[PDB]
Amino acid sequence: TCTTGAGVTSGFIDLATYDNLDRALYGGKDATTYFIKEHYPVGWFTKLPTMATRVSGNPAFGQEFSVGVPRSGDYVLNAWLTLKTPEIKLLETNRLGANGTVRWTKNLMHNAVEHASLTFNDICAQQFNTAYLDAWTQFNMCEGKRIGYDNMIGNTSDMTNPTPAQGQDGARTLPSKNLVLPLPFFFSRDCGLALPTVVLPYNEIRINIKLRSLQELLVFQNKDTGNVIPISATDIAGGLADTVEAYVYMTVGLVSNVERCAMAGTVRDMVVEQMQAAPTHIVNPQNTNNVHVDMRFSHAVKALFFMVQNVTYKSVGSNYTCVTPVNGPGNTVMEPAMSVDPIKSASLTYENTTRLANMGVEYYSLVQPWYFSASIPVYTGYHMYSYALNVGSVHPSGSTNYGRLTNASITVTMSPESVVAAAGGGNNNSGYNEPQRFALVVIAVNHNVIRIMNGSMGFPIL
């Protein structure tokens, strides 16, 4: 069955094939070769996870608590929050009676977390919130880990699946399990950026986390008409346990004695990325369909993430569409018949001299993520404009600083679907049965420099 021409000798023809182009692309005394890998020594170290101690307050829904960074280590390069969700048990004595279902809000994590801040002594270094978390997880998500992430932060087709009352066919109870959320910080962004706790003494490091009330975490959805009303303690069995079991873990690493001694007593300069959120602007599309928002930023902005968010019902969150979700067949939430991002076009202006014309929404939706990001969002909304070649790269890229820039504004032109969904009149299970309201949020990511010297931290650029 062997073939006469087949064999290793057939590669002699390819080896003999050689011309001026071949000797220009390949060859040379100093030309590097594959099949040989150079080996160089690296540092000697080790790592292990440690519980982070609690200092201020106690974990409770609707309250704020602080967690201190443990000492006795050398570098900290990780941080995550674990939380034990309570158990939900709907009752037939609720106000809606039979026509009423309860479920967890979409994206349980990124929710009940806001104003998460890192503080050295008494200064804030950076602070994020739900919109920034959603934008980051939609634009810089490595594939393959998406399933694990959607399993660790909720939306596992169990928390978000509506469950009817105990007197109906669906008697399923929402499970009480634990969920983990990594905290995106400048030290967690890259391995090369870590806090030198060994040379940062007497300067307490705190992480402040504020949770949300339990009322704004459960969506009490009407089975028939798709109307949302706030939840109450008497509606469900057991009650609403304000206190919750939430822990903060982080990874610390130890280095060699000679390396620690060498790095002790030296000035350190680090390049970090922070975020600035413009105040929310309430939009009324009934009056006008064009909205101008002025931005006041300070440092070299990397990208602007913007999206208009449905704010009709405070219970339901992370709904940047134009129509609120409604209950569907099979005790599963279904996307309404019509739902598009309310923004139809956007533009930028620097005291006239419009830099970016009235371009289409699909541009920011697809083209910019396709070219200057590591992923493309799978949900409607989340528009982005990046001044840099790569958003996710820690190394600085093309950017402009708004400190030397004059007043800058962003103009948004809405859509006929948005203006018709703003008013009510929708039939049952249409999502827009009640009048709808929207809000616009703008977030910018900028660069900054942190200097560590003489056991103190600060911003030399100021």
């Binding site: 064999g7 290793v8 000798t9 002699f12 080896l15 003999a16």
Partner: protein, 78 residues
């Protein structure tokens, strides 16, 4: 007190034999005395090696692309 398992016979079949240098064909191709066996137990398994074949292929190719146009013009077409 120490041991390695690389080899013990040095340079009789020299490792660099596939390059262009002096040859050693006078020993491993003929038995030294009558009754001596043949010396191919592990050396077999490396066929068509040595740079001679590659150099011959390069020499044969050289200019086939430019020389294939004429070829049989001086032999067939009157």
């Amino acid at each position: 007190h120490v041991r390695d398992s690389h080899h013990v016979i040095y340079k009789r079949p020299p490792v660099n034999e596939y390059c262009a240098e002096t040859r050693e064909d006078n020993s491993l191709y003929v038995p030294e005395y009558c009754g001596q066996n043949w010396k191919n137990g592990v050396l077999s398994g490396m066929g068509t090696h040595h740079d001679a074949y590659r150099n011959l292929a390069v020499n044969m190719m050289t200019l086939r692309r430019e020389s294939a146009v004429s070829a049989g013009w001086a032999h067939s077409y009157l």
